[PDB]
Every structure is written in structure tokens, then in C-alpha cells.
Amino acid sequence: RMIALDGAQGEGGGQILRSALSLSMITGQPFTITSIRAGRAKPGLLRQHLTAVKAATEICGATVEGAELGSQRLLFRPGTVRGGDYRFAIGSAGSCTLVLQTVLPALWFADGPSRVEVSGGTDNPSAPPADFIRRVLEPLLAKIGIHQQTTLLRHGFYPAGGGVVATEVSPVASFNTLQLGERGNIVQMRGEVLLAGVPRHVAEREIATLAGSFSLHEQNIHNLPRDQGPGNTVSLEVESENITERFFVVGEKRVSAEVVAAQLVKEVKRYLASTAAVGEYLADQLVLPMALAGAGEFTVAHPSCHLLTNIAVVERFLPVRFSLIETDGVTRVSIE
Numbered sequence: 001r002m003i004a005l006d007g008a009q010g011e012g013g014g015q016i017l018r019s020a021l022s023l024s025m026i027t028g029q030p031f032t033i034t035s036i037r038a039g040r041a042k043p044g045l046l047r048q049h050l051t052a053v054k055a056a057t058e059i060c061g062a063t064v065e066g067a068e069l070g071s072q073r074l075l076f077r078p079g080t081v082r083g084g085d086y087r088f089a090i091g092s093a094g095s096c097t098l099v100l101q102t103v104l105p106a107l108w109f110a111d112g113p114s115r116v117e118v119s120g121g122t123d124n125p126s127a128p129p130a131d132f133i134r135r136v137l138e139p140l141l142a143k144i145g146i147h148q149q150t151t152l153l154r155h156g157f158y159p160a161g162g163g164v165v166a167t168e169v170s171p172v173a174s175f176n177t178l179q180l181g182e183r184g185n186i187v188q189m190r191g192e193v194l195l196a197g198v199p200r201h202v203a204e205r206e207i208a209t210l211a212g213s214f215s216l217h218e219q220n221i222h223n224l225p226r227d228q229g230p231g232n233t234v235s236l237e238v239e240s241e242n243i244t245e246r247f248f249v250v251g252e253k254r255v256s257a258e259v260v261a262a263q264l265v266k267e268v269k270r271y272l273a274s275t276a277a278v279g280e281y282l283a284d285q286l287v288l289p290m291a292l293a294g295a296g297e298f299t300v301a302h303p304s305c306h307l308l309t310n311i312a313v314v315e316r317f318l319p320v321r322f323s324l325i326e327t328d329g330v331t332r333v334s335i336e
């Protein structure tokens with residue numbers, strides 16, 4: 001019939017909208033979202049939100065109402081998802097990988113393989129980096145039966161645009177049940193700095209700061225072309241027996257190298273202070289693929305707002321139900 005979602009408790013243009021669009025396209029169930037961002041100084045749908053709506057519309061021939069800047073109500077009626085070669089542009093206002101997060105789950109169910117290319121910001125603080133999708137999320141999708149490969153073609157450092165990320169995807173042939181739990185032993189720790197139009201001593205101090213808290217098996221510094229900057233990010237990959245995780249921080253004006261790296265150290269220590277393989281962010285990104293498989297579980301040390309949001313949206317669109325059981329400081333998230 002018509003699923004009605006609330007857009008005023010938060011994320012109405014963001015995580016609820018993205019997950020609803022994917023689930024709507026996959027299941028063919030229409031939805032409406034109301035009061036979108038009603039309490040924000042610039043309320044309703046902004047350009048980056050509209051980009052996701054428009055991208056979804058393109059891949060399933062949707063009928064839409066309210067997809068206009070400042071609209072606080074959206075009605076989305078999907079048609080049939082179709083594969084193809086798609087190009088989208090979100091600009092400096094949004095994140096390439098969040099457009100991908102919106103459309104890729106629907107293309108797992110398309111009538112053939114697809115390629116999606118998105119231009120815009122790539123190294124934004126509240127979005128998954130293309131390297132996280134490629135090196136953390138995609139190996140797990142593969143275990144679930146889902147095959148997609150993401151490549152970053154050029155960077156656009158928040159808050160500028162200009163970046164380009166592309167993903168090749170094939171329709172799923174068969175789903176598998178992924179079960180994750182403890183992280184197991186460390187295999188190696190890898191530290192990376194990206195610099196663009198930022199002096200090399202910054203990267204030196206950042207790697208040195210990471211090396212001050214962890215024994216780094218790999219250290220990588222990559223200087224990009226000037227015009228992809230200014231930008232700087234620092235990342236740490238933890239490859240373990242049972243999973244690979246990655247953490248990152250984006251450099252900002254008026255934050256020094258030392259403090260930027262310290263933030264990343266604190267986050268990695270928090271990860272390693274719990275037994276769980278899955279990290280805070282990956283957790284919310286496993287909810288939809290596991291739900292679509294119909295089974296799966298993982299443990300996570302602190303279930304986030306995004307994790308619970310995604311669970312709630314999935315449960316509106318699918319008969320799947322999630323169980324969360326806390327045991328000794330970690331929460332087992334499992335499909336019943």
C-alpha cells in the first residue's frame with residue numbers, strides 16, 4: 001500500500017531517505033516521508049538530498065511528488081529496477097559514496113550488471129570513504145553473495161567537489177548467511193596519509209603520531225595533484241584474522257596535524273578495546289545486505305543511532321526482524 005515514514009526525528013533527508021529509497025526500489029513498495037528536516041534553519045530537502053532522490057528515480061523509473069528544494073514532504077513510487085550505465089553529480093554539497101549507498105542495493109536486484117559513476121565530494125567526515133567501501137565493506141558483501149567493486153578515480157576534499165567514484169556491480173545469484181563475532185588476532189596495522197596541496201611535513205607528523213601509539217606494519221604517504229586539494233586525510237587499517245576494518249580522519253583548517261592524528265588514534269584504541277570484529281560504522285552498513293539475505297549476525301561494541309535507524313527502516317519494508325543482545329560489553333545484532 002503506502003508506507004509512511006516520519007522525517008522530523010532526524011535523518012529524514014539522510015539515512016532514512018537513503019535506506020527507504022533502496023528498500024522501496026527492491027520491494028516495489030511506495031513510501032512517503034513527511035516533516036523532512038522541519039526544524040533546521042534551511043529546512044526540507046536540500047540539493048544533496050534531491051540528488052539521491054533523482055538518482056533513485058533514474059534507476060527504477062519512479063513517479064515522485066515533492067522532490068523540490070525546501071520540500072518537507074516526498075512521495076516515491078518506484079517502477080522496475082533496471083541495470084545500466086549511470087552517471088550522477090552531487091557536487092560539493094554531498095558525498096559520492098552516499099549516492100552509491102542509495103542506489104547500489106537496488107542494482108543488486110537489477111536485470112543485468114551496472115556501472116554507477118558519481119561526482120562530488122569524496123573525503124567528507126560523515127560518509128564512508130571509497131577505500132572503506134572497497135577494503136572493508138565489499139569483502140563482506142562478497143561473503144553474503146553480493147558482488148560490487150568500487151574505485152575512486154579522483155579526490156574532492158570536503159568541502160569542495162570535483163571528486164569521482166565509480167562502482168561496478170552484478171546482480172546477486174545466491175545469498176549466503178554471514179556470521180561475524182570476535183575480531184580474532186591482529187594480522188597487521190597499516191597507516192596512510194593522503195595530502196593534496198598540503199606540505200609534506202604534515203604527513204610526516206601524522207604518521208609519526210600514529211607510530212607513537214601503534215606498531216605500524218605498513219606506512220603509506222600519497223601526495224596528490226594540487227588541484228585535487230587542498231586536502232588531507234589520515235587512515236589506519238586493522239587487518240585481523242576475521243575481518244579488515246579501517247578508520248579515518250579528515251584534516252580541517254585550524255586543526256594541526258598532531259591533533260588530527262590523535263583523533264584517529266583515540267578511535268582505533270576504542271575499537272581495539274572491545275572484542276568485536278565489526279566497527280561502529282560498518283555495523284550500520286551491514287543491516288540492509290543482511291536483511292536482504294534474510295539471515296546474518298555480527299557483534300558490535302556500541303550500537304549507533306544509524307544502526308538502529310537502519311533496523312527500523314528495514315522492519316517497515318521487510319518481514320525481517322532484528323534481535324540485539326548485550327553480553328559483556330558487546331551487542332550481538334542478529335536476524336531472527
Ligand SMILES: *P(=O)(O)OC[C@H]1O[C@@H](n2cnc3c(N)ncnc32)[C@H](O)[C@@H]1O
Pocket residue numbers: 014015125126127128129132247248280281282284285306
Ligand atoms: P552518519 O550521518 O554519521 O553517517 C552516514 C553514513 O556514513 C557512514 N560513515 C560515517 N562516518 C564513517 C567513517 N568514519 N567510516 C566509515 N563509514 C562512515 C555511516 O556508517 C553511515 O552509513
Ligand code: NA
Pocket residue numbers: 011012013014015
Ligand atoms: Na542528513
